[PDB]
A paper describes a structure:
We solved high-resolution X-ray crystal structures of three peptides using ab initio phasing. We named this peptide apCC-Hex-LLIA, and systematically as apCC-Hex. Using the experimental apCC-Hex structure as a seed, we designed short loop sequences computationally to connect adjacent helices to generate an up-down α-meander structure. For the antiparallel α-helical barrel proteins, the seeds, models and experimental structures for sc-apCC-6-LLIA and sc-apCC-8 are very similar.
Here we describe efficient routes starting from validated parallel and antiparallel peptide assemblies to design two families of α-helical barrel proteins with central channels that bind small molecules. Computational designs are seeded by the sequences and structures of defined de novo oligomeric barrel-forming peptides, and adjacent helices are connected by loop building. For targets with antiparallel helices, short loops are sufficient. However, targets with parallel helices require longer connectors; namely, an outer layer of helix–turn–helix–turn–helix motifs that are packed onto the barrels.
Numbering used by the authors:
A (entry chain A), D (entry chain D), E (entry chain B), F (entry chain E): 1 to 30
B (entry chain C), C (entry chain F): 1 to 29
Write the structure that this text describes.
């Protein structure tokens, strides 16, 4: 169903934001 | 530091998005 | 209800984004 | 500067999310 | 670099948000 | 409809995220 499809896409965005946060922590530890 | 604080805020946003996904599956069921 | 919970989570996300913006200005200034 | 421009764009995204929340509350009310 | 990597992930987030937007439009189509 | 408005707001957020991605590339350049 399409709501389950959107839910999976949000789960994918959440994973990408976590990846950005990890990168910023590296910029700060710069 | 300020950049580390921003990163922690992004992690909080991700947790909120996962909660939205859980709610959407409940709506569908 | 489930949709209202989703809206509340979006409002929380917006507050977190405003905090990130303030921190960016402190980095700049 | 450019960081201040990004800050402004994040403030705009926050405003737009707040609008989506407003709209979802309206769907739920019906 | 790390900023360019963040930029790429932000672009992917934007693409997924557009897919969500399209699925929302399809939900409106039944 | 309201879902369609939400979809368009998500598209606008996606555009702002793309602009942030551009500015981050410019900061890196720079
Ligand atoms: C039937 O009923 C259906 C209802 O269906 C409802 C569906 O509702 C769906 C809602 O979906 C909502 C989705 O929201 C996504 C929100 O994404 C936010 C993304 O934020 C990114 C923020 O990124 C910030 C990056 O900042 C970098 C700073 O870098 C600084 C470097 O400085 C270096 C200078 O030198 C030190």
């Amino acid at each position: 169903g399409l709501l389950e499809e959107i839910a999976q896409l949000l789960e994918e965005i959440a994973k990408l934001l976590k990846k950005i946060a990890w990168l910023l922590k590296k910029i700060a530890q710069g």
